[PDB]
Amino acid sequence: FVSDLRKEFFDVIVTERVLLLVAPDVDALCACKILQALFQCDHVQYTLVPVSGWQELETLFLEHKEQFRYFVLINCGANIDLLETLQPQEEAIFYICDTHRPIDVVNIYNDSQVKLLIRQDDDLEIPAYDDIFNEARRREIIFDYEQYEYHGTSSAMMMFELAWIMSKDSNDMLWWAIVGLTDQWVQDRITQMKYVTDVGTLQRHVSRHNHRNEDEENSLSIDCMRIAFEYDLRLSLYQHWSLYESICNSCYTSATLKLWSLQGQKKLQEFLADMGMPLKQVKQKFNSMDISLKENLREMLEESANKFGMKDVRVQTFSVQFGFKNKFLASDIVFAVLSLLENTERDEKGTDNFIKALDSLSRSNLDKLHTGLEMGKKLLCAIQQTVASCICTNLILSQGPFLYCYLMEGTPDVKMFSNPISLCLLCKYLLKSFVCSTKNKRCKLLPLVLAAPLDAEKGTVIMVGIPPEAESSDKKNFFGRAFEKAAESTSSRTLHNHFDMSIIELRTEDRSKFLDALISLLS
Amino acid sequence: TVREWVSMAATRLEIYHRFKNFLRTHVDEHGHNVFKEKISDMCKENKESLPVNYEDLAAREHVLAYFLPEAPAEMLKIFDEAAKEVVLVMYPKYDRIAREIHVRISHLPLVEELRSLRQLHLNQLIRTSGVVTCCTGVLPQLSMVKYNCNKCNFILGPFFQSQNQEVRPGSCPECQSFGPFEINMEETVYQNYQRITIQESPGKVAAGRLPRSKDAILLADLVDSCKPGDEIELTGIYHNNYDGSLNTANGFPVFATVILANHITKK
Numbered sequence: 001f002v003s004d005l006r007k008e009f010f011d012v013i014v015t016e017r018v019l020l021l022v023a024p025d026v027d028a029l030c031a032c033k034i035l036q037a038l039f040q041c042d043h044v045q046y047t048l049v050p051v052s053g054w055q056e057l058e059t060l061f062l063e064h065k066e067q068f069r070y071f072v073l074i075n076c077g078a079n080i081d082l083l084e085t086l087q088p089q090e091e092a093i094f095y096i097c098d099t100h101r102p103i104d105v106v107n108i109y110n111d112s113q114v115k116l117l118i119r120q121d122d123d124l125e126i127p128a129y130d131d132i133f134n135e136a137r138r139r140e141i142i143f144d145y146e147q148y149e150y151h152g153t154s155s156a157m158m159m160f161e162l163a164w165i166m167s168k169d170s171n172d173m174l175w176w177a178i179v180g181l182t183d184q185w186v187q188d189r190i191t192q193m194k195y196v197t198d199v200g201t202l203q204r205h206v207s208r209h210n211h212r213n214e215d216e217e218n219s220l221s222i223d224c225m226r227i228a229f230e231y232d233l234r235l236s237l238y239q240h241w242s243l244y245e246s247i248c249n250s251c252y253t254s255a256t257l258k259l260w261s262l263q264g265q266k267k268l269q270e271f272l273a274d275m276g277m278p279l280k281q282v283k284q285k286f287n288s289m290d291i292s293l294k295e296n297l298r299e300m301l302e303e304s305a306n307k308f309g310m311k312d313v314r315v316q317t318f319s320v321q322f323g324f325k326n327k328f329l330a331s332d333i334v335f336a337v338l339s340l341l342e343n344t345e346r347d348e349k350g351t352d353n354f355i356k357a358l359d360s361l362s363r364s365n366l367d368k369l370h371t372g373l374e375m376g377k378k379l380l381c382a383i384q385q386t387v388a389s390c391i392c393t394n395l396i397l398s399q400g401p402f403l404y405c406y407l408m409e410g411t412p413d414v415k416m417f418s419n420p421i422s423l424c425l426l427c428k429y430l431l432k433s434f435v436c437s438t439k440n441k442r443c444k445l446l447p448l449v450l451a452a453p454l455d456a457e458k459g460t461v462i463m464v465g466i467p468p469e470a471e472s473s474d475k476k477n478f479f480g481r482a483f484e485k486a487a488e489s490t491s492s493r494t495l496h497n498h499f500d501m502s503i504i505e506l507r508t509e510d511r512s513k514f515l516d517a518l519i520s521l522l523s
Numbered sequence: 524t525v526r527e528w529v530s531m532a533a534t535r536l537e538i539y540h541r542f543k544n545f546l547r548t549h550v551d552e553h554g555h556n557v558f559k560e561k562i563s564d565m566c567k568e569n570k571e572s573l574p575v576n577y578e579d580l581a582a583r584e585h586v587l588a589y590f591l592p593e594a595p596a597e598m599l600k601i602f603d604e605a606a607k608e609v610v611l612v613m614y615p616k617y618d619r620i621a622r623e624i625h626v627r628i629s630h631l632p633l634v635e636e637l638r639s640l641r642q643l644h645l646n647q648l649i650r651t652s653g654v655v656t657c658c659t660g661v662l663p664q665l666s667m668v669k670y671n672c673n674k675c676n677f678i679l680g681p682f683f684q685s686q687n688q689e690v691r692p693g694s695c696p697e698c699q700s701f702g703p704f705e706i707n708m709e710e711t712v713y714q715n716y717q718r719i720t721i722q723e724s725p726g727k728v729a730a731g732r733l734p735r736s737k738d739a740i741l742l743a744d745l746v747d748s749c750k751p752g753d754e755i756e757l758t759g760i761y762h763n764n765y766d767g768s769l770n771t772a773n774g775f776p777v778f779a780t781v782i783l784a785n786h787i788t789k790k
């Protein structure tokens with residue numbers, strides 16, 4: 001509810017000792033980078049400590065409850081009553097900048113410690129204070145208000161706005177804001193219209209900073225960051241590996257052409273023949289292809305996609321060129337950072353995984369970025385193979401209104417999906433591919449509930465669920481509430497450590513009763 | 524001579540139009556257009572070879588089906604040009620993946636043996652069978668050589684080369700420097716070459732007689748389509764080539780014979 005940021009947020013903590021708590025997500029990392037830049041520019045001491053879940057958040061708050069007074073939380077601790085759990089003092093002030101829209105009502109109506117930085121111009125239906133705090137009507141409002149868990153605006157955009165108000169905004173901060181927005185887009189947490197509006201805003205800012213002029217941008221030396229707007233294709237990492245593998249391992253092209261089936265492969269070959277590109281060049285690395293073939297690639301690809309039932313093959317995004325050879329796109333950075341955050345070979349030193357992910361975002365650690373790109377390629381290949389295996393062998397069963405799929409222990413590359421973000425990406429990709437493949441009209445508008453063997457020793461399986469796919473979805477998810485109610489009804493042993501209530505753990509023994517109770521509840 | 528008749532410009536144009544119509548309009552037993560699918564499969568896998576069955580060609584054009592076995596060179600050249608035009612119409616961008624579409628003739632009604640080939644079969648499309656015994660490696664051969672002129676630094680036009688003689692240069696526009704003519708390696712066009720050796724089948728050879736053998740020449744897509752010790756059905760142009768060494772050896776003027784392979788099928 002904080003209305004002003006130049007006077008109520010920054011000036012309060014200029015001459016104090018701040019403690020930053022950042023959740024593990026790319027948008028949070030970008031916001032943290034911008035905040036660190038501002039703090040280092042204004043000579044403000046701070047301590048940055050990684051926070052993963054609710055239990056770790058509480059423990060880390062208990063560790064430093066005396067050494068610090070002012071606390072800043074990014075992309076965490078806004079959908080729950082932080083005051084009750086943490087039990088803070090009067091002196092302590094908590095600044096919260098999180099994207100979760102179902103904000104806790106108690107934190108909303110409080111002026112002691114919870115100064116929410118969340119923008120009040122967003123689509124948020126705040127219930128009446130008197131109705132909640134002053135009785136069945138209160139329960140009705142509670143159920144009508146906390147039904148879904150749709151996300152909100154990007155934290156990096158708020159940080160960039162804060163920097164802009166102070167006139168301390170550079171190209172490096174604008175790039176981090178762009179990366180945060182594109183991270184939100186990639187995870188499919190915001191609607192298309194909101195993405196277009198945010199892209200327009202960031203385009204206005206880019207046009208402001210990159211004030212092109214004759215003989216001013218020509219005498220301007222290379223190695224200065226130059227962000228530009230580009231209406232580019234919908235392929236993943238297509239400038240690093242070959243075009244063929246990029247087409248075969250994306251999500252739009254793989255689902256539209258049904259590449260998991262042989263007829264899909266034949267249609268892909270017909271598509272490539274229609275484009276007019278030799279199979280030799282297409283399978284080579286993008287940086288070694290012929291110049292003539294790369295002249296008007298976008299237009300020809302769009303046309304040949306239009307012929308083959310592919311319409312949304314072009315999206316609006318940004319680029320960056322800081323030197324002779326370096327040139328990236330926002331989605332490439334998102335994939336690299338995401339891969340570095342969630343690694344199984346580097347399961348040791350998870351805090352060091354976070355450290356490497358944070359370091360990769362600076363222009364002086366490009367090697368870590370390249371390793372992240374390679375890891376992202378491997379992850380994309382793994383999820384594509386897993387989706388194909390699940391669809392071909394018919395491991396998805398329409399158990400009532402919601403679909404249920406379970407990954408077997410012997411399934412290859414199953415350790416990769418124990419991580420939350422990888423599991424969510426697999427779930428969305430699998431749902432889209434199955435919707436494209438199946439012919440049942442009713443099944444095309446059903447949700448998916450995927451599982452994975454989180455821990456073999458304790459017999460715990462991780463569970464996730466996503467809203468049913470639609471042409472224009474609201475991205476609203478009710479799976480957390482239903483999961484909680486079904487857990488209470490069955491007296492199950494479930495944990496909600498993750499900041500997203502849609503992801504919970506579950507014992508193997510309690511699986512069947514939990515599933516049946518969920519079927520009954522959703523009926 | 525059929526060669527003279529098919530060499531006529533009007534006859535050439537008529538044959539070209541008939542072949543184009545045959546390629547564009549040839550329904551199957553169920554009415555499906557066979558050549559559409561054939562060209563789609565050829566361009567889908569980046570090939571430059573289109574097979575044509577002799578039976579349906581005879582069914583739709585008896586005049587051309589009779590002309591072909593007597594003048595197999597010019598008729599096949601016209602077929603290649605028509606096929607290229609049709610493919611370019613169907614796939615406008617195929618000029619990148621290929622530069623010349625070849626036509627392969629299948630199911631030729633006449634079948635002969637290596638022991639019954641005489642001078643009657645010279646310069647005619649024949650179909651034999653046998654077992655391969657030798658296969659040389661793939662070597663590059665001059666297809667279209669671009670001779671230059673030292674007197675003016677201007678380079679003469681392309682000059683086609685055949686497998687029977689050595690091509691000689693033409694005439695420069697005004698500075699007639701016939702002698703000082705050379706070849707550049709960056710504008711000349713080459714093609715693959717492979718000379719297999721086929722012999723009579725072990726079972727079909729007469730007990731009293733001994734196995735015979737004939738040489739065959741493979742070019743362009745045909746190379747590496749056979750391995751020594753394989754039973755094949757070879758269709759090609761029976762060709763006569765002079766060999767003075769055999770003349771001196773036998774003591775009588777004799778000429779060597781080779782087969783310019785056109786279609787090879789492995790059984």
Ligand SMILES: [Zn+2]
Pocket residue numbers: 672673674675676677695696697698699700
């Ligand atoms: Zn000359």
